[PDB]
Design a protein around this ligand. Sequence first.
Ligand SMILES: Nc1ncnc2c1ncn2[C@@H]1O[C@H](COP(=O)(O)OP(=O)(O)O)[C@@H](O)[C@H]1O
Ligand SMILES: Nc1ncnc2c1ncn2[C@@H]1O[C@H](COP(=O)(O)OP(=O)(O)O)[C@@H](O)[C@H]1O
Lengths: 95, 248, 157, 400, 44, 50, 277, 226, 52
Amino acid sequence: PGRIDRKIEFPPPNEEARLDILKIHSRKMNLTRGINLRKIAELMPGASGAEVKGVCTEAGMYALRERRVHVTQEDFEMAVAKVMQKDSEKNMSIK
Amino acid sequence: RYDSRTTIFSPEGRLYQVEYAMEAIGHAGTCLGILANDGVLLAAERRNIHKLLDEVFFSEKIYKLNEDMACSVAGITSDANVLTNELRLIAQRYLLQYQEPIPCEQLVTALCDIKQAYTQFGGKRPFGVSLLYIGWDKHYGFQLYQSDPSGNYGGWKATCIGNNSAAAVSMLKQDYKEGEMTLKSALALAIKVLNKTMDVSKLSAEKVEIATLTRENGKTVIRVLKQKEVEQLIKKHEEEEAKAEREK
Amino acid sequence: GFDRHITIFSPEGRLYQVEYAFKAINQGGLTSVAVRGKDCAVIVTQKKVPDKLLDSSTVTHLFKITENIGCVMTGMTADSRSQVQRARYEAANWKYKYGYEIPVDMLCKRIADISQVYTQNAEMRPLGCCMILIGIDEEQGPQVYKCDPAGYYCGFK
Amino acid sequence: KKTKGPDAASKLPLVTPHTQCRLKLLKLERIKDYLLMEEEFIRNQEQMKPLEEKQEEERSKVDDLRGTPMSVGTLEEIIDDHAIVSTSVGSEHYVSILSFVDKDLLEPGCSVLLNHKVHAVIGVLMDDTDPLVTVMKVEKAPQETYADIGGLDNQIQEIKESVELPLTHPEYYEEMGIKPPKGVILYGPPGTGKTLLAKAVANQTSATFLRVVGSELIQKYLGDGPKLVRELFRVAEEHAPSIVFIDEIDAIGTKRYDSNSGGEREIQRTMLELLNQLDGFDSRGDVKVIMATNRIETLDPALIRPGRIDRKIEFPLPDEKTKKRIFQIHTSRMTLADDVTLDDLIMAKDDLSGADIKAICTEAGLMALRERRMKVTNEDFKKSKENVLYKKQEGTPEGL
Amino acid sequence: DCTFIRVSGSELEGARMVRELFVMAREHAPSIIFMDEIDSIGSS
Amino acid sequence: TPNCRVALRNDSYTLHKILPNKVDPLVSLMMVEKVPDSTYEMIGGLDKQI
Amino acid sequence: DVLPPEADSSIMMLTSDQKPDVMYADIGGMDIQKQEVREAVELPLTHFELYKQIGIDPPRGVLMYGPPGCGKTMLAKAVAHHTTAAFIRVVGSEFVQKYLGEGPRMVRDVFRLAKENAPAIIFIDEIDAIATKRFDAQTGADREVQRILLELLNQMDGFDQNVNVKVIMATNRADTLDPALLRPGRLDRKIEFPLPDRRQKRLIFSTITSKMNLSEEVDLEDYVARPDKISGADINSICQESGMLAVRENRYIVLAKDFEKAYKTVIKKDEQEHEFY
Amino acid sequence: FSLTTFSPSGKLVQIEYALAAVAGGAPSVGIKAANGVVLATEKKQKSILYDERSVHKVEPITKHIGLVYSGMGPDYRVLVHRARKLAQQYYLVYQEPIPTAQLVQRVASVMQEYTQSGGVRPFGVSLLICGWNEGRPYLFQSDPSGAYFAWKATAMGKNYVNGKTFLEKRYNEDLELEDAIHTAILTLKESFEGQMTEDNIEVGICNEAGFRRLTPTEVKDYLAAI
Amino acid sequence: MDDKALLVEVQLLESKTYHALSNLPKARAALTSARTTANAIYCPPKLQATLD
Ligand SMILES: Nc1ncnc2c1ncn2[C@@H]1O[C@H](COP(=O)(O)OP(=O)(O)O)[C@@H](O)[C@H]1O
Ligand SMILES: Nc1ncnc2c1ncn2[C@@H]1O[C@H](COP(=O)(O)OP(=O)(O)O)[C@@H](O)[C@H]1O
């Protein structure tokens, strides 16, 4: 009781969900005219909306050091590199 | 006091060690086998695709284990290697003894017997690996089998064993049709379900490894579909997707 | 736990049993020095003799492993004697299997392999005695080596 | 510090149809008319006063002596004329109180007033409203009745006899001179146990009820789990003699573990204290302890003995008729359908308990309300079975 | 328009505390009281 | 009005003025929060869940 | 009357601004990261206007859960001078005292001092062992500490990015810290400042021994190659203490003996890498 | 128990600790070039007392199979001794196949007594193997529990992460001639703290002609002009 | 890329030309970047003297 009402679970965001979260978080910010945000999200393996937020803030910070209102695709991919630094470190790959 | 392993029951009566290993088999690895008339095929997901490899082993998941069958592991590679070696040894020992290729069911029963022994007696870890087998024999023709670390194998005809195995098998159930199934449409179904279970759309032919077993004139041919053929399959699937999406 | 109780890898990624076993050598209260030279190799250890009722004739820590190899032990004397006996057995067995005398580096390598087997497995324990063995080797001059409770055999000049 | 609470609520739960009809409407009209008439009567009695007598003799003598400034402090001790009270910041006053002095409501450990200046007690705050250290009588005498659960007639009769040996016909075993607080040890499948609570509400129709579920493996150095429940059934003897429902804890908190020593103390403390309270030779009281569980095996030998803890009762799974009755009860509030699809959902069913019945009844309504909203959704006929599958019975790899 | 009462559950006695937010602290009849990850493990 | 602040007197402590809320501003944030906006438009990718 | 000054009400440090004690690049710890710290100084380094327009949300709370390695305060004594900004030691150990009722008031006063000077950074020390440990039960005045931390949370929430002042706590272990400060939305950037990092340790030794011009004219035959490759922790504080342990004024220069004695004093014997290598 | 053991629910905790130990600190980069393979490693002896011509990090297991390793040198010896015995047994059974690269994959596979039979305590060394008796080179890695990885370029040191990053950024590439050993030395330089010299750095090369541990003369020659 | 000696030399030359053009603050920034880059090379005896 108090939990038998529902056991709704959170699926980790798919690539298109991550695209949607990118749109939500980047509507507020300013960036360049052209960007393939769908591919940008798909480049991120799995991850989550927290990671989408991290990518958005990393793109903002990277555009800060250049001091321009138009976040370029190169800065965006540098932000995608925030999905990195986790990887699997050593190639355990034992499965 | 000395450390003793856990090959025991539960107060309820469950072998929770074996159950944990079987569930961990779902974690990591992704393979699926689809059985069809005149050809049965395996699809595997290339987990690590770092650009610094060379792909000289020619096969990581799919293993040729006999003239008339081929398996695919989804477990810890350490156990997978020894299990494949034992499987080939068993098949070849049968070939020596009976001068006849070993039936797939007998081969799978031998392997699952060895895994059952490993989970049964002694202070030995269960073999944390679950593998598929596709094969052809004289008695039952094309056969597909799935063995879990519990040693309780099952004779399947369309199954998956990987991480999103639930999603893959749901897709297979939705778009699987027996009898009508043929080799080419089986390939289309396999690539479609792999695209579904691998989040990144437009799967590169490098991230997917697939091998088809076919019956030529009195001889079993197990061909691992190479990069060009795989990506041509991908292109045909892409044409089908675009057509179906646009026609609405 | 038992990471620090048995010879198993630490979660931090270290081996604490051999790390302890090295300090066993410091335990026992003794020091030893070995100097390789232009042509000779001389070693020396202090001879801590408490009370003269002992026999200073037989309290030594240096031994002949073979006709040309001399060893100095450091650490617990029981393990030291065991490893000296093992080294002598290895030298004799080598001279039996292969005609020429055992090179000092090869002997130290075999002793180190024995110690490495000891730090492997869990039934036995490493021997707390570090051995410095020296000898003249042709085409090599004097040679000095040190085998340790871990299995790392090196050490020179 | 707590004796009783004012029960002037729960206006006549017996609304016969419990569904919108003329009879129920007329009953509600009579209820609201009674409320109106009672409010009017009390207001006219208080306004059309019997007599005007000065300042009701309040402001003349006691109110002024009580004075305007006051402070609240606990009352500690009592003496023949003075009273010894522990006011705020650890102050202590031994003063006799003669204005607004209600000795019965005063009591040690209660909040009283201090008139400042010449600090003496001038009144008491009987409300106080802070007896919150250990609260287990908050749910006392639950309103649930026999009719709430059906199809358990044998068990109902057995428990009713076991707890109506007191109250009813006490002179029976008073003349027999035994006065047995044996309690009842209840078995039952894990799929039930709140059904054990339901069969306890039958007794709860008389006197109060206390609950200790799970408690703890009393690691506490003082122990005092069972000892405090002993104090609390002493409190229940002060109140109407209440029952103590220790379902599950009688099983874990009192587990028949073969281990003897070096084991959580409870085995030392808890079982021994349980037996000490369950033996009538130590503690009196019409208190009847209901030790319910779902693991009969872990019955401790001390708990096993009918000698001290008699009246063992087994709760079985519902039969076909019991399933029919319980489903009727649970769907009666919701007007399942007009086709009355009753027996199809249970004829082939096996090992279905009260919790599952309630769950499936709730989920049928949930699924209808989801999108199939059709009042008596015609879909209910088969959707009751649809959410009766609902998976979720059990899942554990394959192993088979 | 209920609340945003957010408690992690990893606070350490577990008794009391929650009583105020359960009834009195609410500050609103509508109350969602969102608890974070349930740090209390199975059987605790 | 209950659950507000008041001013009292020196010795008799009689009421002076029913002051606005002081308890709420001081301990507004202990472990709770009032209603934020965070509207569902910002929530994305989980429509099949919401 | 209302007293204008707020810092000296309870002392607890004051305006460490307008004073170069350790500038910035003169630090021996090089970076550790220091990029997240330049990120933290971006808000003092104006850039509040560039936080908008671009659409970024600049960080507000920077916790450094490191041991005394890197100093953990050479970043706040610096930065505050790299971009001129007020610097306050706060000191958590002093704060927990009889002035727990005045604790809320002093938090308000120091927050007001910071708001008065948008170039200001709060630096709080010694949180872990005394200020709001979460695993050991409340012992007496621990409720007072929790109420003080609650008022600190209230003040940091009332800040709500009103100005460009910054707040940084420095802790040895963040595990005992309360989730209220630890949760995002109050403090986000967690930085760990590890041990001397033998390469970085040698760099620190060079930097310190250069601070005092070549250790006040140290002799050539003293090089740190031997006493630095110790693998013996020897935090930057210990490195500075060893450098100042050239106080042997029997001679006007420094020899390797002084460094050997400095390393010998206050040290623990940890060795034996050859087995691992 | 007496094997590669300690595997909890979905984990290999002992193996993971072994890899934490194999993090080590000897960089030991490896590069698979078109003409052959280079295995370079750092020999940073404590003090000048130790010797460099005494012990080696690169071992020729056979005619054209060379081997370099990672942490736990005492375990690495035993492992290389076992590997030599295994390659020799294979060559003795399948007589005279001059087996190095058609044997490099096979010896990497027979590196299952490596770890699948751990020996109560698993080995704590990850080793790179190079072979060129197939007309093509081969660089494989065997880790304290896994198997042949078939790398093209990698590192196994304390800074193996940024070492591998450096390898890919400097484009290990495919057209690189045999003298990618310069790039290997550069990759070491990154994970090296000192003026590296001939005795400080040990490198072996395995080209189609065979395998050879470069002497300090050639190592110093390559280190010059860097 | 991840060259280090070339980066240190380039940054040092940039600092030198800022000093030659009397660009003191940019020279200081470039020199600080030069130090941050030059931490990598442990014993470049000529280069360390150039930086100092
Ligand atoms: N036979 C029944 N008739 C009416 N109501 C029942 C019956 N059995 C159970 N219930 C109701 O369902 C609830 C769950 O009972 P139970 O199955 O014992 O729960 P649990 O399995 O959690 O102990 C009880 O509170 C009770 O009110
Ligand atoms: N250039 C430098 N780099 C790193 N640390 C230094 C440097 N110069 C001095 N220090 C030391 O850093 C120390 C700061 O330590 P402290 O503030 O006590 O640590 P924490 O901030 O963890 O409490 C000072 O005692 C000082 O000796």
